[PDB]
Design an enzyme around this catalytic site. Structure first.
Site, short mmCIF file in Angstrom:
data_model
loop_
_atom_site.label_atom_id
_atom_site.label_comp_id
_atom_site.label_asym_id
_atom_site.label_seq_id
_atom_site.Cartn_x
_atom_site.Cartn_y
_atom_site.Cartn_z
N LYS A 9 0.84 -1.07 -0.46
CA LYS A 9 -0.36 0.27 -0.21
C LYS A 9 0.80 1.09 -0.27
O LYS A 9 2.41 0.82 0.08
CB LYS A 9 -1.28 0.24 0.74
CG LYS A 9 -1.27 -1.50 0.85
CD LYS A 9 -3.18 -0.97 2.31
CE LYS A 9 -3.78 -2.35 2.37
NZ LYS A 9 -4.93 -1.48 3.28
N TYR A 49 -12.70 -2.02 -4.75
CA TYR A 49 -12.45 -2.18 -3.22
C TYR A 49 -14.40 -1.85 -3.09
O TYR A 49 -15.11 -0.95 -2.41
CB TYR A 49 -12.13 -0.77 -1.84
CG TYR A 49 -10.73 -1.24 -1.74
CD1 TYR A 49 -10.60 -2.68 -1.36
CD2 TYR A 49 -9.99 -0.36 -1.83
CE1 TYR A 49 -9.54 -2.61 -0.42
CE2 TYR A 49 -8.95 -0.48 -0.94
CZ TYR A 49 -8.13 -1.00 -0.42
OH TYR A 49 -7.05 -2.08 -0.25
N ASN A 112 -2.52 0.54 7.68
CA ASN A 112 -1.63 -1.23 7.56
C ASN A 112 -0.97 -1.84 6.51
O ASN A 112 -0.63 -3.24 6.65
CB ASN A 112 -3.01 -2.07 8.01
CG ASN A 112 -3.58 -2.81 7.23
OD1 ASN A 112 -3.79 -2.16 5.82
ND2 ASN A 112 -4.71 -3.14 7.72
N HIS A 115 -1.67 -5.21 1.24
CA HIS A 115 -3.71 -5.68 1.00
C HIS A 115 -3.28 -7.57 0.59
O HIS A 115 -2.33 -7.20 -0.73
CB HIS A 115 -3.98 -5.28 -0.23
CG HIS A 115 -5.51 -6.02 0.00
ND1 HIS A 115 -6.81 -6.20 -0.09
CD2 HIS A 115 -5.16 -7.20 -1.50
CE1 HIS A 115 -6.82 -6.82 -0.75
NE2 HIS A 115 -6.18 -7.54 -1.18
N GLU A 126 -9.15 -10.27 -7.80
CA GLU A 126 -8.48 -9.42 -8.38
C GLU A 126 -7.32 -8.97 -8.82
O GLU A 126 -6.08 -8.50 -9.19
CB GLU A 126 -7.60 -9.33 -6.48
CG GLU A 126 -8.52 -8.56 -5.87
CD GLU A 126 -8.43 -8.54 -3.87
OE1 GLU A 126 -7.50 -9.51 -3.95
OE2 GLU A 126 -9.23 -8.81 -3.27
#
Length: 149
Positions: A9, A49, A112, A115, A126
């Site tokens: 990320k 998302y 965080n 992913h 994905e």
């Protein structure tokens, strides 16, 4: 062999942890099969998302995931989806096991590090959304004879 989608990320990218994160994946025995540093198009973010679309944290997920490049990955190995999730750690870095990526490197649930696909289903979704077949190589590694039976 089983494959999953991983994404480093923007927080990790901006903290210069690309190398650190990749090392943790590599040494586990997973095989980097596709990877590319890329800016995330607004279209791509929303559809990726999609499933959260209503929530209290969606606006800020879109703005965040597009605020800097990401390292999009396709990783291959036996039991890849759940192995990846294992080394990644729980969503909230405050609950992720020490030793796991999020556990060691992340601070807050919204920021965080990485992913990971959460199921074989969303893995195939994905992978196809982020990558085209011709971007995904497929090769034997010397260590394969020593990770599996």
């Amino acid at each position: 062999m089983e494959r999953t989608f991983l994404m480093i990320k923007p927080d990790a990218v901006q903290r210069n942890l690309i190398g650190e994160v990749i090392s943790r994946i590599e040494r586990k025995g997973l095989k980097l099969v596709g990877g590319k540093l890329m800016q995330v198009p607004m279209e791509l973010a929303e559809t990726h998302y999609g499933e959260h679309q209503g929530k209290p944290f969606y606006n800020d997920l879109i703005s965040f995931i597009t605020s800097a490049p990401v390292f999009a990955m396709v990783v291959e190995g036996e039991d890849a989806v759940n192995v990846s999730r294992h080394i990644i750690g729980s969503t909230n870095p405050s609950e992720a096991s020490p030793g796991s990526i999020r556990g060691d490197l992340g601070l807050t649930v919204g920021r965080n590090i990485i992913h990971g696909s959460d199921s074989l289903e969303s893995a195939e979704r994905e992978i196809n959304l982020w990558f085209n077949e011709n971007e995904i190589t497929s090769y034997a590694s010397p260590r394969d004879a020593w990770l599996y039976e």
